[PDB]
Design a binder for these strands. Structure first.
Lengths: 166, 167, 123, 229, 37, 338
RNA sequence: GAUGGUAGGAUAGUGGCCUACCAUGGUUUCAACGGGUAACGGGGAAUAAGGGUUCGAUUCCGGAGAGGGAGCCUGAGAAACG
RNA sequence: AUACAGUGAAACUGCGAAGGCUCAUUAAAUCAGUUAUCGUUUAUUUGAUAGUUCCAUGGUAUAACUGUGGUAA
């Protein structure tokens, strides 16, 4: 990154003759670490005293949350199909916040068969993924700042809310 | 060339100015760690084996163990550009360091037949082999700290309970 | 009321109150509008000072451009040249503000490059 | 290089003593060197005021706090052991620090304006003041700008003065800094020039802010003693 | 489409490199009789 | 003596592996060869030294002098890179993951320009000096280094292109698209000449061609896919091909020839985990180079038998083959240690 | 990026601060935007002096620089006079 | 004072220097006050603030130091 200041750009009035200043330390834009899938490597960068910041690049073990009961359990990552904060970001298959990524939902199968007995009330277009294995789930946590991959599962309303999109 | 030689377990080390470089040519194009014989560096020390351990060349520049390229190169060490000779030994070493790991056929009145002792015995208890009143006071101050703080906290939480009952 | 991706929703339908003499309309308490930066449900909290004036343009959405003429006691040429000010402001689910419409706003948490004020009243 | 509040004579020096960090701010306090040395004159220079600070005569707020630039702000009761000196220092009517002399039963406490009440962590009600005494558990009816009375042996609130219409208020801040009389008017606006207004000898009127004013008692009965002329 | 495809002329790259005369070691007739089909 | 992996009656060696008495018999070739936990892309310059390796987090440039066996510098560039080339020595051009293009010099960062859409590949033309940059969509752009203009961008098919390359001895512009068509343009005419279609016999899903290459005879063309299937092509009966399924087959990214050293008609293929090498006119594997981690891409040093990968680990692996050729003049005691 | 909206990146965090997508906005005769110096002078920036009436106390002219641009590192604080 | 015991060159340590010249001309954007940050960082100052235990004390590896040396340095 470069900057965080209004001095390089124009305001709501249209001004000119900028030529302002050598940029300070507190306009610090670090490089955009597009977090991907790999082996888990988090860079421990420093800022503002001992404010360590976890910059995750190759995180896997996503803690994704069963919605209707709120069961955040551990799984892997496959790939993001739709994220128009950059439509090339899904072409390159990175992993950022608020992305809709696919999960092999085998521990969710284990929890359902463990606290319900039988195997398969829950919606049908996610029951198809209960059968097959890959369910859609959206990342909540920030791997570029907190270094973690947490998320929430897609269950019904939010599922169709994304499936009608793409 | 000069050959520094070290017999480590006896604690002996001495340099020997060996001219007549076809004696020297046994070491040529052999990098650090690879062993050698006494047979092609000398005749009076046969059955000898020396693990080489670097050496400053003329212009004094050291070699660090195992890079490549027996000329001089400019690396980054403890980070700034320092000049360092390559690990492989060639014709232009001033001194070359050697560790003798087996005595062969002749006694040496510098290395074998003369030796130095060590420095001094150990100081730590476990190094000599191979408090409890503080343990009283630590535990007593810890249980007293618990019996002060964890009781006083509830002792003003009950005053909060009195304010909540009166409110 | 969902024309964009990424789970358009309140962020924890939801309802709160900034207090301090400004009402929350019943659709803004329990209605289908999201209230992302409208301070009644919102994510922002109120502070600062509250300014009042009529408008000039409400052309783009979530842009309320207030005008604010005010008295100032000029001592230089001993006559009052009349004031005029401008401030962009995000929408609220209480009034489609047209030309005229003296309204007031409270200072909070810079939303765009130049907006710190969001509508809390219409009269 | 000085402020106005210290009552500092100009024929003193060149470098003015910056107070160190502490309870109060820089702009609303006087350190101990400008207190003892050149106001009531128990010293002649910095060397001997450091000497008596090492001797530890000062007992501000019941603790010793041996420091030269310790920022004694509003009504920190400076206590000196020899000749039982008890000093409550308040504001006069023209902006300076009038240091009134009090007695032991009055210096056994102080009062403090409450700034905010918090549900901070683990269900604990919470109160701060201008010296930052985070004391546990007041009643739920502590609004902003009320007045707690600190214990000064332990830290507990002993008495409480509610801020409402008809209370004796002290103004520290803005162009009303250091006035007493608290009743002509009440006017709470919604973000500025909001206050209770203060009388004069002819009962004149005045405007200030909420945070720049704080209560000291009742209409005729403050349990603080005040100096006179 | 503001910063998207500015068809301007830029200062440092106007003589960043220099061309070559013969270039391809083949002939253009070799191109034509190379991919006639 | 460095250990060798098992293969088909042939030996390879790695230097700077994940595993590479050992501390006191270290075999380190290039000092400070390690990045910040991954690697983007490595390539060796046309002259006998100065290899360049792009960065991973706070991405750098990392020029290594081969005649000094260490690092020269690391210009921390502004954004994360995907593709670049080297233009002789000191000049080089890069493009990042955003649609911006950097021009590094001896002083570094001579300019930063942009392309209107997100780009994926860049090549330079030695003849009349226009870099062709392949991006997403209908758009294959030019930035000519003569007069710094822009040129009349090449109209593609729908989705775009994964790789562009021009032929060396005659200039035939390749562009590996998504819909199996290879879209050969002519660097003379600025028009299409052919729209060759790629076929198979398995047809799992509609693969996209990701790697294009030529060599210095100017008659054949090496083609890739998004499935782990190498392809050869000639003008001689250009509709079929010879194909090479690979035993894992995710996405082949680097297919490069051996057209300048001995042991001829041999080619290196490289997908995400493995990089193999086989012979022309039969399609039988000469060797393979299985590392302990995935591969971001590779490169092969000219004149000799050594390879440099960019991977997803902390160091980069170098792979020496003492049967393909010798070790070069700056590594001229690798044949003495192993 | 002009003006705003949605999301992400980076942040110490607010923020078109940067990028994807979308809308064609926004300031102005109630002075936009632009023109220069006794802008080595001015603006209280401050002390005022018991008769000097724009001399007469000071903070700051603007930002930079440690041979020249570039990149990196340290720290509660830095794009370090070391 | 036969495991330490005072002077103390040279070495580790705690800190020191804790704020100094020249050059091209910015019109409330340089500056001064003020509102706010439940929109944020914070060493030091000050007030507060910790409850998971199956069949008498834990490991080599480096200095300083000796010893052999290289180099004009």
């Amino acid at each position: 990154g470069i900057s965080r200041d209004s001095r390089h750009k124009r305001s709501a009035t249209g001004a000119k003759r900028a030529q302002f200043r050598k940029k300070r330390k507190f306009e610090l834009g670090r490089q955009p670490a597009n977090t991907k899938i790999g082996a888990k490597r988090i860079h421990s960068v420093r800022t503002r005293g001992g404010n360590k910041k976890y910059r995750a690049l190759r995180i896997e073990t996503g803690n994704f949350s069963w919605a209707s009961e709120g069961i955040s359990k551990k799984t892997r990552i496959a790939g993001v199909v739709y994220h128009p904060s950059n439509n090339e970001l899904v072409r390159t298959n990175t992993l950022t916040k608020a992305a809709i990524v696919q999960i092999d939902a085998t521990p969710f199968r284990q929890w359902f068969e463990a606290h319900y007995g039988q195997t398969l009330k829950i919606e049908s277009s996610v029951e198809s993924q209960f059968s097959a294995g890959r369910l859609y789930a959206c990342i909540s946590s920030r791997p570029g700042q907190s270094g973690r991959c947490d998320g929430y599962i897609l269950e019904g309303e939010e599922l169709a809310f994304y499936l009608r999109r793409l | 060339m000069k050959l520094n030689i070290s017999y480590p377990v006896n604690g002996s080390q001495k340099t020997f100015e060996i001219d007549d470089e076809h004696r020297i040519r046994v070491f040529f194009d052999k990098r650090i760690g690879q062993e050698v014989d006494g047979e092609a560096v000398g005749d009076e020390f046969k059955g000898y084996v020396f693990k080489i351990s670097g050496g400053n060349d003329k212009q004094g520049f050291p070699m660090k163990q195992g890079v490549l390229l027996p000329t001089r190169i400019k690396l980054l060490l403890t980070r700034k550009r320092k000049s360092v000779r390559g690990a492989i030994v060639g014709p232009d070493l001033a001194v070359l360091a050697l560790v003798i790991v087996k005595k062969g056929e002749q006694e040496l009145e510098g290395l074998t037949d003369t030796t130095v002792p060590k420095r001094l015995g150990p100081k730590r208890a476990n190094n000599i082999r191979k408090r409890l009143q503080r343990k009283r006071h630590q535990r007593a101050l810890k249980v007293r700290n618990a019996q002060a703080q964890r009781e006083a906290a509830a002792e003003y939480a009950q005053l909060l309970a009195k304010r909540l009952s009166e409110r | 009321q969902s024309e964009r991706a990424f789970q358009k929703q309140p962020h924890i339908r939801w309802y709160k109150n900034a207090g301090l003499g400004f009402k929350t309309p019943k659709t803004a308490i329990e209605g289908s509008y999201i209230d992302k930066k409208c301070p009644f449900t919102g994510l922002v909290s109120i502070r600062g000072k509250i300014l009042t004036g009529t408008v000039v343009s409400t052309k783009m959405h979530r842009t309320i451009v207030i005008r604010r003429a005010y008295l100032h006691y000029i001592p230089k040429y001993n006559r009052y040249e009349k004031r005029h000010k401008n401030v962009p402001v995000h929408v609220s689910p209480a009034f489609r503000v047209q030309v005229g419409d003296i309204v007031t706003v409270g200072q909070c948490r810079p939303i765009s490059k130049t907006v710190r004020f969001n509508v809390v009243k219409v009269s | 290089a000085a402020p106005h509040h210290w009552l500092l004579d100009k024929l003193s020096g060149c470098y003015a003593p910056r107070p160190s960090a502490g309870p109060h701010k820089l702009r609303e306090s006087l350190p101990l060197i400008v207190f003892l040395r050149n106001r009531l004159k128990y010293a002649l220079n910095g060397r001997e005021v450091k000497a008596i600070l090492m001797q530890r005569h000062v007992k501000v707020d019941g603790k010793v706090r041996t420091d030269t630039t310790y920022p004694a702000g509003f009504m920190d009761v400076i206590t000196l052991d020899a000749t039982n000196e008890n000093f409550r220092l308040v504001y006069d009517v023209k902006g300076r620090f009038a240091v009134h002399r009090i007695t032991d039963e009055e210096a056994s406490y102080k009062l403090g304006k409450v700034k905010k009440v918090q549900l901070g962590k683990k269900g604990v009600p919470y109160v701060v003041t201008h010296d930052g005494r985070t004391i546990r558990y007041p009643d739920p009816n502590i609004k902003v700008n009320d007045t707690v009375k600190i214990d000064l042996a332990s830290g507990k609130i002993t008495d409480f003065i509610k801020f409402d219409a008809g209370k004796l208020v002290y103004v520290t801040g803005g162009r009303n800094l250091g006035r007493i009389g608290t009743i002509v008017h009440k006017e709470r606006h919604d973000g500025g020039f909001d206050l209770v207004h203060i009388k004069d000898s002819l009962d004149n009127t005045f405007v200030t802010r909420l945070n720049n004013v704080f209560v000291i008692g009742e209409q005729g009965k403050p349990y603080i003693s005040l100096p006179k002329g | 489409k503001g910063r998207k495809l500015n068809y301007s002329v830029q200062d440092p790259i106007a003589n960043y490199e220099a061309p070559i005369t013969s270039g391809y070691k083949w002939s253009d007739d070799q191109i034509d009789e190379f991919f006639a089909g | 003596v460095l250990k060798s992996t098992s293969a088909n009656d042939v030996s390879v060696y790695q230097v700077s592996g994940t595993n590479v008495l050992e501390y006191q018999n270290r075999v380190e070739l290039i000092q400070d060869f390690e990045f910040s936990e991954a690697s983007n892309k490595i390539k060796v310059s046309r002259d006998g030294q100065y290899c360049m390796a792009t960065g991973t987090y706070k991405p750098q440039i990392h020029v290594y002098d081969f005649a000094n066996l260490s690092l020269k510098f690391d210009r921390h560039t502004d954004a994360e890179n995907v593709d670049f080339t080297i233009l002789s020595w000191t000049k080089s051009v890069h493009l990042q993951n955003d649609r911006s293009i950097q021009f590094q010099n001896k002083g570094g960062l001579h300019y930063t320009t942009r392309i209107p859409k997100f780009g994926r590949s860049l090549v330079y033309n030695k003849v009349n000096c226009d870099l062709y940059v392949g991006a997403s969509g209908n758009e294959l752009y030019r930035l000519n280094l003569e007069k710094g203009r822009f040129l009349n961008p090449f109209k593609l098919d729908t989705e775009g292109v994964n790789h562009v390359s021009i032929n060396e001895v005659n200039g035939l512009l390749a562009a590996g698209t998504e819909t199996n068509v290879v879209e050969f343009w002519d660097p003379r005419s600025r028009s299409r000449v052919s729209k060759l279609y790629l076929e198979n016999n398995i047809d799992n899903r509609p693969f996209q061609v990701t790697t294009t290459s030529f060599r210095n005879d100017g008659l054949t063309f090496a083609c890739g896919t998004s499935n782990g299937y190498s392809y050869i092509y000639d003008l001689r009966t250009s509709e079929p091909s010879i194909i090479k399924d690979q035993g894992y087959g995710f996405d082949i990214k680097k297919i490069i020839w051996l057209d300048n050293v001995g042991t001829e008609n041999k080619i290196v293929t490289c997908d995400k985990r493995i990089a193999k090498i086989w012979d022309r006119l039969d399609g039988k594997a000469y060797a393979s180079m299985e590392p302990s981690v995935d591969i971001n891409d590779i490169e092969h040093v000219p004149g000799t038998g050594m390879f440099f990968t960019a991977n997803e680990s902390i160091p980069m692996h170098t792979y020496y083959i003492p049967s393909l050729g010798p070790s070069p003049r700056w590594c001229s005691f690798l044949d003495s240690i192993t």
